[PDB]
Design the sequence.
């Protein structure tokens, strides 16, 4: 079969990337009991056994192949526009119930606050269990990843697109239930299945709760006495400990670390780190403690992440390192760094070579050194044959983050974290936590622990991009971030009261009571 | 063997690409009697048969594997720095002899105009003959390509990097013989050969004459009266005929069509096509004709190419179509064009969706219409299965070049062309030739008839990029451009005397005899 042959070929290539570029392979083998061979063999058999397999069927197989790695950074996307969609956003409450937190339609049979009980007659958890990956381990992160999928099916992601009408069973706020008949918003496939055309191909012949939300989903913490509304959501409000004293608390939400992707971002105006700077300065002299909302963050540029950190501390902070998978590629990069920084001795020379600013991070002489060290260390590992999963080397060689020369918030910080915090959104609280800089509150992060790289290549299976992790981050005391993520100081999940009536008062109250303590006791959260 | 295994994997990948995304395949088979299945097996063997193959040895096999397509667009590069230079530059005058034309060192024996008889006891020819390709067919184009590397060997391009001193047997311009012993400038590899590291690798344990030159090489045609000071070498000059009669001819050289790679291009000021405008408006009002230097051009951006052509005419110019190979990626491109121009019914709407211009080409409703057509066409070949070597389709749907609405040189034009003109530098003269807009002189063009795409993918073999051709251009009369190239109106090669002392007077004279003949006639008698 034409589609079958291409799929196997395309599958063999994916298999080969895993052996030369997927770093956490050893980690996935142990922590998950994952097995490349098992995976390969199984996938090939699925492919060969099919009676006249369709293009999508194969994509679904490759999709499941990489899906088995249980890696939020490891996936495959396709050249397919076929999709199914229901305009409902649901959020799982601590006790296990599923409430509708947003309805993007004028239909009125379901309201914000109704509880989802069944889908097509099957209990939510059941439907969800058919959306999990091959090596599911029931973590909240996986659960939520699956939840995003409940009402959004895309062939571009390897999903099997449903269609037609379906029955959701809800529980209205006052106890009664209803069964609602709904129809999937369906977009038919616009890219012809190859299997359908194969036979006619003759031989050639000449002649929001949305991840990344700028505003996030938390309501103000109290009476606003300042707010920027420019590019980031940032404001200053009050609070009042039980003693009757009032404090000025700041609130800032970092939506992503992929700045070129922030809503309303003009690439002709000043970059977002310069605005971040204005916010922090306002905070420095107008606030007594800072609350950073970082939930539902997709991650992004490490250099950008570093910049934001450099402005949130007056002292240097230790950064975790990465065990990298190597190829001559990274070698030349190493060479290139050395040849570019050969003759650099002063801060000034650093700047004329690096740009004096690396996506917000200040180009210093030490940066030139750090960079120089990295690359040396890389070349070393290469000659010592340590290219399978090198000893830990910090990204860019930055052994640590050095406070920003001009702006630096030095007061107590409080970071809110989610089960939907990936990569840089993992690292941010990691760095603030290991150096004891901020109080992390909320829930264990997802655990995408290692940088991503994407791969493209022509093929007839419709593969667009295959993303893979190229390193394994190692925290200071030796823990890997991959899969495990970061645990916050205070475990504070959202309750059904927080969620049901989009107030989150129970949550916010605890955060306020918590931050008041940092203001009084000086950090040091006792009770 | 490790290096052997990776090499065979990556070879199997390049081979697969050739069957899915190499449009010229069917052509190279009939024209070069080439065979994939055969070419691949040969390299497979060249790899197995080798004892302890080096990363280098392998790169060379792949370099040669592709090199056997005799396509100036199909090539491979690597993350290797080992190079061997030599500040010298040859050129091969028409008589079939090789002469020197440049020295980039410190005063040394070898003189301008000195012939080249041998290298270390071998007659130049045979030397170059070792630099030809698996299917070299002896044409100025190929030969010139070889010559380029004769004094520049690079591992990154897949060359065996020689070293140490050597002897060039030169012949003084008057009859006497010499032999100057020289030592290549060497660059030792910085990327450790994988074969040397293999053993120690333990499993991962957890826990000028420059193709593209601005000025180019030709000397001013005569007494300069005006000259532009921008990016392009443009000036005006008197010219008398064989009757004492004087005319003001114009001169403009298009170095490359990849506008962003122009010597001194300032990415913040105006784009090169705007300077082109100014230069022409001037020419339009101070010239009786126009000479265009288009020799030594690596092609560039197809749209920019159109933009220049659109300012060099007062009537639409018929564009040659491309036979393409399709994958779902192209299909989606088609879909995306259609959803983007869905409701564009005016010029304002067009300009809004596509911008006032696309790399210089003026955006019209006509343009939006072209693009919409392009999409329907690609989609139609897909559904019909015409995906191996599509029915001819114009790039972007542009069936013809429409004159710029504001600048249009309409007076006779002369274009100079040689064997170092590729992709777009193939189209320029052919479009102007097939439409009878200009007089075309020089020598046949390279023969790179089809657009390019670059494939990158991680590997241990050190492959960096593999470029291939995604189409086969077809001229108005059915002929191709791949290999064949574009024939000039008048065959005006550079003869010994021209090169010998970089005077090219002999050549530049027959040019003006021609430019002149052009000023004295309403002539382009289209019949």
Sequence:
């Amino acid at each position: 079969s034409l589609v079958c042959k291409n799929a196997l070929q395309d599958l063999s290539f994916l298999e080969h990337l895993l052996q030369v570029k997927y770093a956490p392979k050893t980690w996935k083998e142990q922590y998950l009991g994952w097995d490349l061979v098992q995976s390969s063999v199984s996938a090939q058999q699925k492919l060969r056994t099919q009676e006249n397999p369709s293009t999508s069927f194969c994509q679904q197989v490759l999709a499941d192949f990489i899906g088995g790695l249980n890696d939020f950074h490891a996936g495959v996307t396709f050249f397919a526009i076929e999709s199914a969609y229901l305009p409902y956003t649901v959020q799982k409450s601590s006790d296990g119930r599923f409430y509708f937190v947003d309805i993007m339609t004028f239909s009125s049979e379901i309201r914000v606050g109704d509880e989802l009980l069944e889908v097509d007659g099957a209990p939510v958890q059941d439907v969800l269990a058919t959306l999990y990956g091959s090596n599911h381990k029931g973590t909240a992160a996986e659960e939520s990843a699956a939840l995003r999928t409940l009402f959004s099916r895309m062939a571009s992601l390897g999903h099997k697109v449903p269609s037609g009408r379906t029955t959701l069973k809800i529980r209205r706020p006052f106890g009664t239930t209803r069964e609602v008949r709904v129809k999937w918003r369906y977009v038919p496939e616009g890219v012809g299945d190859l299997a359908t055309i194969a036979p006619s191909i003759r031989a050639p012949q000449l002649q929001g709760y949305n991840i990344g939300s700028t505003d996030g989903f938390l309501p103000v913490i109290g009476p606003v006495i300042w707010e920027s509304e420019g590019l980031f959501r940032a404001y200053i409000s009050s609070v009042t400990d039980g003693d009757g004293k009032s404090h000025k608390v700041g609130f800032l939400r970092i939506p992503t670390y992929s700045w070129q992707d922030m809503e309303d971002f003009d690439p002709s105006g000043p970059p977002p780190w310069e605005e971040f700077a204005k916010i922090i300065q306002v905070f420095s002299s107008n606030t007594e403690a800072l609350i950073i909302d970082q939930t539902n963050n997709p991650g992004g540029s490490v250099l950008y992440l570093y910049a934001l950190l450099s402005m949130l501390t007056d002292r240097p902070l230790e950064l975790p390192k990465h065990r990298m998978i190597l190829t001559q590629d990274e070698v030349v990069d190493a060479l290139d760094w050395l040849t570019l920084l050969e003759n650099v001795d002063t801060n000034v020379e650093s700047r004329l070579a690096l740009g004096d600013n690396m996506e917000g991070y200040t180009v210093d002489l030490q940066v030139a050194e750090y960079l120089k060290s990295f690359g040396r260390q890389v070349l070393n590992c290469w000659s010592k044959g340590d290219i399978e999963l090198s000893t830990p080397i910090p990204l860019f060689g930055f052994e640590k983050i050095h406070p920003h020369p001009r702006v630096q918030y030095s007061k107590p910080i409080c970071v809110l974290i989610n089960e939907q915090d990936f990569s840089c959104a993992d690292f941010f609280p990691v760095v603030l936590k290991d150096n004891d800089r901020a109080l992390i509150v909320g829930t264990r992060t997802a655990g995408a622990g290692g940088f991503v790289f994407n791969v493209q290549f022509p093929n007839r299976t419709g593969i667009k991009t295959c993303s893979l992790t190229g390193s394994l981050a190692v925290r200071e005391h030796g823990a890997f971030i991959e899969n495990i993520g970061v645990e916050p100081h205070i475990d504070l999940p959202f309750t059904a009261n927080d969620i049901r009536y989009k107030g989150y008062s129970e949550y916010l109250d605890k955060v306020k009571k918590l931050v008041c303590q940092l203001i009084n006791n000086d950090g040091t959260i006792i009770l």
Q: What stands out?
A: DSSP finds 16 helices and 25 strands in chain A. The CA atoms of residues 9 and 257 of chain A lie 36 Å apart. Chain A has three domains: 1-83+326-387, 84-190, 208-325+388-527. The radius of gyration of chain A is 25 Å.
